[PDB]
């Protein structure tokens, strides 16, 4: 149930998650749930896209 | 993760046949569909399409001398005992001899240790099961004859008591349906029972 809520929240915000911290700053997840799930979900980083 | 698993001979055999290498091995007995009959070899197909083979020394009994063609026919199905399995080529060798097909019954390695198995109770139960397999069916015999009466020996003697000397009565014998006892009055309160053996009987109730 939490996965479907997370997917719907991401699709509301724009179907793209820029940063891991946005699971907390955008109120998408709670503190302990994020603390559990932070290192097991990842965002592919492309150096050509992020020069900064 | 670990590397992609690549199937071995046993896994390929289990995949393609759905028979494990445990339930299909040396010594087991299975029914096989005969397909070819020759003078020296026989080719059969098992239930899972594994092509079998039997040689001349494994088709016929040692005391037999008839040709293999006369003994078996194409399309017949028989019991055979596995002598070798080739798990890579899906081929097996079998034997139709009595020593292999029937004697090998205890195919499981049950731990029959005397301290860990109730040997005597098993023997008693098995003996009782054989004593129940010895049970048979039986019924009385009916014969149509004017001087025949379905009576016992003492009953026949009592029946002949009311009749004078020389009258004859016929009763079934205790030795079986193939025997007939004829009782005739020798003297007052003296009777002779004579057993008659029947040959070339058309039926048990027939004469």
């Amino acid at each position: 149930r939490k996965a479907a809520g997370l997917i719907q929240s991401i699709q509301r915000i724009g179907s793209n998650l820029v940063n891991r911290a946005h699971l907390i700053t955008e109120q998408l997840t709670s503190k302990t749930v994020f603390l559990n799930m932070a290192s097991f979900v990842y965002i592919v980083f492309d150096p050509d896209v992020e020069r900064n | 993760r670990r590397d992609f698993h690549i199937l071995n001979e046993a896994e390929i055999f289990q995949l393609l046949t759905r028979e494990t290498v445990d339930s299909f091995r040396k010594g087991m007995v299975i029914p096989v569909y005969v397909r070819k009959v020759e003078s020296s070899y026989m080719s059969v197909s098992t239930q899972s399409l594994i092509a079998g083979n039997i040689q001349r020394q494994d088709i016929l009994e040692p005391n037999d001398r008839r040709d293999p063609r006369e003994v078996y026919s194409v399309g017949q199905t028989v019991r055979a005992c596995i002598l070798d399995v080739d798990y890579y080529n899906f081929k097996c060798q079998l034997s139709l001899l009595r020593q292999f097909t029937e004697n090998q019954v205890a195919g499981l390695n049950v731990n029959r240790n005397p301290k860990f198995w109730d040997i005597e109770s098993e023997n008693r139960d098995r003996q009782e099961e054989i004593d129940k397999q010895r049970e048979e069916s039986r019924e009385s015999r009916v014969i149509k004859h004017p001087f025949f009466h379905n009576m016992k020996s003492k009953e026949a003697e009592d029946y002949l008591a009311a009749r004078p000397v020389g009258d004859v009565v016929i009763r079934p014998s205790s030795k079986g349906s193939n025997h007939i006892t004829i009782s005739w009055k020798v003297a007052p309160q003296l009777y002779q029972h004579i057993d008659v053996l029947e040959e070339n009987k058309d039926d048990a109730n027939a004469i």
């Binding site: - | 759905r18 494990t20 299975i30 029914p31 569909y33 197909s45 199905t77 099961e129 397999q133």
Partner: protein, 198 residues
């Protein structure tokens, strides 16, 4: 109408259907008209006004369906034809090394009797495949050495000494159909070595 007065109970009144609501009493056989649980029957357990709860007959579990979808049918008489992928008494491969025979069939489930005797309840999708064995493969050999084909009646000698007619053959196991064993609609599994042909 039904009322405490006898003189009122002997009167028939014609009433429009637009002002009638069905009354469902606890412990009545009812068959579902329409919905996801269509053609499910069972006994009413709880009547929460508009919503009615009943223990099913097929799934044997409580199902909550609205009262508008219920008809009082005292008998199920559900036909399972034109459903699933499996006729009754089909020899179905459950998985890689498991097989069985369909004993009872349902709209979205099946009852399978294993070769060893264990009964299973599975959805149709979970069944691995259906074994369409050839007629030559569907032949076995009794304890005497006499061939026994499908439809041949045989009777055991070991064990309980039961009797039945051959329904399916798998390896050394014979699936037999019998009149007196009502426990599994006559279907009991025995090895061919245990039987003698009649």
């Amino acid at each position: 109408l039904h009322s405490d007065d006898d003189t009122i109970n002997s009167e028939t009144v014609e009433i429009p259907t637009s002002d009638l609501r069905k009354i469902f009493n606890v412990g009545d056989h009812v068959r579902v008209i329409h919905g996801k649980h269509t053609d499910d029957t069972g006994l009413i357990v709880e009547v929460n006004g508009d919503k009615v709860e009943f223990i099913s007959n097929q799934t044997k579990r409580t199902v909550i369906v609205f009262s508008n979808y219920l008809i009082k049918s005292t008998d199920s008489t559900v036909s399972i034809n034109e459903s699933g992928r499996f006729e009754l008494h089909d020899l179905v491969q459950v998985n890689s090394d498991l097989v069985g025979i369909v004993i009872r069939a349902q709209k979205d489930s099946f009852d399978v009797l294993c070769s060893d005797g264990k009964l299973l309840s599975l959805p149709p999708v979970s069944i691995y495949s259906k074994l369409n064995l050839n007629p030559n493969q569907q032949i076995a050999i009794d304890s005497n050495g006499v061939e026994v084909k499908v439809g041949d009646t045989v009777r055991e000698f070991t064990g309980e000494r039961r009797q039945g007619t051959i329904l399916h053959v798998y390896r050394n196991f014979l699936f037999l159909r019998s009149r007196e064993i009502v426990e599994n609609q006559g279907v009991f599994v025995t090895s061919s070595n245990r039987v003698k042909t009649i």
